[PDB]
Amino acid sequence: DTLCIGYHANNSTDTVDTVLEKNVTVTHSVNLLEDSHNGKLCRLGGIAPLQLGKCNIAGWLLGNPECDLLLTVSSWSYIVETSNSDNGTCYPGDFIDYEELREQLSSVSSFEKFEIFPKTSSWPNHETTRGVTAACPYAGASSFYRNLLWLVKKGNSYPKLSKSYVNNKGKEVLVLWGVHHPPTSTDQQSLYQNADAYVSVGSSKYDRRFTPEIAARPKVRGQAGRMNYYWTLLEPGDTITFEATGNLVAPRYAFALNRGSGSGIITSDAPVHDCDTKCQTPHGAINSSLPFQNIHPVTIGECPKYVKSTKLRMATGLRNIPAR
C-alpha cells in the first residue's frame, strides 16, 4: 500500500516570466493588461461627445460659417477635434491666449449660448449689415462669424460707442470679440472714419486697450488686413463694458458656462456611434476591469492605468509539469 503527495497539472499553455527564468508555463494565471478597444467614440454618462469635425475650438466658439452644424449643440461628454479640424479663424489674425481658452473648456461640460448684444437693437448709430468678407464665405457669398458682429461706419460717421452687459447668469460668461486692423489708412477711413480709433474693454478684473495697427501684410485668404480675437470670463454679477471709435468686431453671442467634471478635448479620427462606455480613448472605448491598458495614455472617464507594456500576466497557479 502506497500514499503519494503531489501537485496539480493541466493542459494550460499560459506562460509568465520571473526574475530567474523567462517563459515559464503555469497552471493558472491572470492577465492584468487590457489591450482591446471598440474603435469608436462613445457617449459617457449618456451624453454624446461634441464632434467638431472639420472645425476646431476657435471656429466653434467664433461661429465660423463652416461650423453651422454645431450651432444647436450646448452639452457634451467631451470635445473631439479630428486631424482635419482646420476651420477656425477664416479671417486671418491672432487668437490671444487661445491655448488657455482651450484649457478652460476642458472643465466645461455644457453652456447656454445667448445673444448678449442683439444685432438689430444694440447699435442704432452704426452699420450692422455690411460686416462680411469673402474670407469667411457661406454658400459662395461673403459672410462672417455667426457669434461676432463686424461693425462699420454709418453714413460717414462712427460715433464713439459704449456698450455694457451685466452678467445676470449666475455663472461665468465667456465673452469673445475681435479688433480689426486694416491694411491701409484709406481702408481704415472707408470703414470707420476715425483715423485714430481705439477699442477699450473693461470689467472689475479685465482692462485692456486696443490700437489699430495699419499695414499691408502678406495676404492670407485674400486679406492683407488682420483681425485679432480676444475673450475673457465675466464673473457672476460683474460688468463688461465696450468702448470704441472704430475697429470693434463686437460680441453677438456669448456663453454661460457650466463647470461639470473632468472632461476635455481629444484629437481622434475614430467615428462616433450609438455606443456607451465608462472609459474613452482617442482610438476607441475600453470596457474593462483590468488595472492596466496600453491602448492610449489619453483617457476620459474611469480607465485602467496607461502602461507601455506588451504583457503583464501574473502566475496564480503553479509551475505546470504535465510530465506527459
Binding site: 503527495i5 501537485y7 496539480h8 516570466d17 503555469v26 472632461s263 503583464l312 503553479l318
Partner: protein, 160 residues
C-alpha cells in the same frame, strides 16, 4: 524550486489531480485515485487571491487625462509638459512590470513551499509505519485501507 519539492524531489504534477493544487494519490489494495488536500489548497487560494488584489489596490485607476496645446513661443513648457508625461509613464511601466516579475517569483516559491510542508507533514505523521520511497511517496508497512488513507489526509492517523 527554492524548496526542492516542485520540479524537485517530486519531478512532476498530476493532471489526474483535479480538485485542488496540492493532494494525494494513494494506491491502496482497494483501488487507486486522487484526493486534493483542502487545508493546503484553500489556504494557498486565499493568499494568492489576496496577493492579486493587493497588487491591484496599489495601482491607481486613471481618470480623465488630456493634453494641452502650446503656441509656437512656448516650446520650453511644452517640452517640460512632455518630460512629465513621459517620466511618470516610464516610472509606472517600470513599477508594474517589476512588481509582476518579483511576485511571480514569490508565487512559484510559495507553491513549492506548500508542497514541501505537506510532504513533511504527512511524513511526520507516518514515521516508522511507512518508508520514504522518494518522489514524495510513502510505502506503508502495515497495509492501509481507504478508511486508513483518509486518516492520513485529514491529519488524524496517529501511530508512532
Amino acid at each position: 524550486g527554492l524548496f526542492g519539492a516542485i520540479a524537485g524531489f517530486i519531478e512532476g504534477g498530476w493532471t489526474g489531480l483535479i480538485d485542488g493544487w496540492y493532494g494525494y494519490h494513494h494506491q491502496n489494495e482497494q483501488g487507486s485515485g486522487y484526493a486534493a488536500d483542502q487545508k493546503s489548497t484553500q489556504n494557498a487560494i486565499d493568499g494568492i487571491t489576496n496577493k492579486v488584489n493587493s497588487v491591484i489596490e496599489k495601482m491607481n485607476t486613471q481618470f480623465t487625462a488630456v493634453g494641452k496645446e502650446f503656441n509656437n513661443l512656448e516650446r520650453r513648457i511644452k517640452n517640460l509638459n512632455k518630460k512629465v508625461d513621459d517620466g511618470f509613464l516610464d516610472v509606472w511601466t517600470y513599477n508594474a512590470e517589476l512588481l509582476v516579475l518579483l511576485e511571480n517569483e514569490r508565487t512559484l516559491d510559495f507553491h513549492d513551499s506548500n508542497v514541501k510542508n505537506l510532504y513533511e507533514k504527512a511524513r511526520s505523521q507516518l514515521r516508522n509505519n511507512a518508508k520514504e520511497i522518494g518522489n514524495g511517496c510513502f510505502e506503508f508497512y502495515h497495509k492501509c485501507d481507504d478508511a486508513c488513507m483518509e486518516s492520513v489526509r485529514n491529519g488524524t492517523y496517529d501511530y508512532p
